[PDB]
Symmetry: D2
Subunit: 106 residues, 4 copies
């Protein structure tokens, strides 16, 4: 997928995570978000469409996804040990990373 | 140090990080926060003073610091590669972890 | 790319990292490995070609790359702060993760 | 505790993890190792007893424990989701970090 449709996947599964009932559902959504994030890693955002692959802006852009994946990874562990409530909270806490990247490059 | 004084160290160095000018200063403050966090790992918070070392609440309490240290660790790398602005932002993004723990156990 | 060619990229850049001279070269190789790893995340290995997307084997398979990317992510920070020698060592220490996965699913 | 007796705790619990039978036992040992590692964070190793708190050697020394804790943290999650065998393997995979630090500063 491309950046935008990777972003919609993150956003739609985050939504699924909010209104989830059991652990299994959070894990699946988390997994999908992890894949989306992985796929976004290699994209160039319009705001830096001019700028080169090797610019400090693109390194920092790629870094944001590094953070995001690590966060999803951990949240998924919480899902896998049955701890639904804290998984959902960890998912909520992702927004701090989403917004940080948007603010700079969106 | 004790829990409370560990907490004040985190809070005071976070404040130092906000109003910092160069990379070196952020790194030092970050380092101090990392130490404070490490020290807090083993404390029992008043709200769980009743509860045992092995309760799922104390595991989740200890887990919060595991998150926090990892976050500081990464933010410090940013400080060490001269990237002041993004280090400061990563420091701000810690607040999501602070508040998450306060909410449950403070 | 496909799994095999993703694997050769990891292996060839690891080799580049061994015999590197400056920081910039390690960072580039590390970046490439990170991308390769991200790409591998979604593959099904022949040994589990029978088994479903949702099997505990495929979860543990995906988990191995989650580890690997996090490790590359940190090693790259070391590359970015000029610390060549320790970056190279962190790269060598990846082999423990490579071999762990091979052992089970290769 | 001091460095040496922190090191014996890591080593004795690693031993406990090898010869463990159930998940609960691995988790406890892992927890103890996490605490030991946290406690070691602030020590000065004899080989750098001369050198200052702020030397690049002491930063790299402290970094090694950052890596180690993150690794234990993840291994403990595996313990907490009942996956004994892979927890034990993750514990084994710690040795790559132990040895890396010994080699440079022991
Ligand atoms: C769970 C985390 C996140 C969610 C839910 C999320 C959600 C979204 C949504 C809904 C959009 C609008 C897409 C459009 O322009 O049509 C978007 C755009 C974007 N996001 Fe995210 N996002 C997340 C994380 C991130 C991160 C970590 C980065 C960068 C490191 C990032 C960079 C962007 C960029 C650059 C755009 C603009 C895409 C474009 O217009 O071409 N986002 N995001
Ligand atoms: C940058 C991160 C954090 C900051 C700035 C912070 C700050 C503080 C502050 C200012 C207090 C109140 C001090 C007082 O007047 O007594 C406090 C209390 C507390 N914090 Fe944090 N905190 C952070 C992270 C955490 C985390 C991760 C946890 C748990 C995992 C935690 C658990 C607590 C608890 C339990 C108290 C209550 C202590 C008491 O009542 O004596 N905090 N924190
Ligand atoms: C630096 C890290 C790694 C390196 C250098 C590496 C290297 C390789 C190499 C050289 C091959 C054989 C290529 C061929 O002749 O077909 C291979 C195959 C494989 N690797 Fe890795 N690998 C790494 C990490 C991983 C990880 C983390 C996993 C799983 C989570 C994994 C799973 C596999 C599998 C399943 C195969 C078999 C592919 C096939 O038979 O087509 N590897 N790897
Ligand atoms: C699970 C991981 C590890 C185990 C099992 C382990 C085990 C040990 C043991 C058994 C000793 C001998 C203590 C003595 O001198 O009497 C030791 C020493 C030492 N270890 Fe570790 N170690 C680990 C990780 C680390 C790490 C990550 C570092 C540094 C980043 C480190 C630094 C040292 C140092 C500096 C000494 C020498 C202490 C001294 O002589 O004053 N070790 N370790
Ligand atoms: Zn795509
Ligand atoms: Zn949608
Ligand atoms: Zn799943
Ligand atoms: Zn965790
Ligand atoms: Zn204390
Ligand atoms: Zn420093
Ligand atoms: Zn980072
Ligand atoms: Zn591909
Ligand atoms: Zn680069
Ligand atoms: Zn690091
Ligand atoms: Zn001590
Ligand atoms: Zn002993
Ligand atoms: Zn326990
Ligand atoms: Zn994990």
């Amino acid at each position: 997928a491309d950046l935008e449709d990777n972003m919609e996947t993150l956003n739609d599964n985050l939504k699924v995570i909010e209104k989830a009932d059991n652990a299994a559902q959070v894990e699946k959504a988390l997994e999908k978000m992890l894949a989306a994030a992985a796929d976004a890693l290699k994209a160039t955002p319009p705001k830096l469409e001019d700028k080169s692959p090797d610019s400090p802006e693109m390194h920092d852009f790629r870094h944001g996804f590094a953070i995001l994946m690590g966060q999803i990874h951990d949240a998924a562990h919480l899902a896998n040990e049955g701890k639904v409530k804290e998984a959902q909270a960890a998912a909520e806490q992702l927004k701090c990373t989403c917004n940080a990247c948007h603010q700079k490059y969106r």
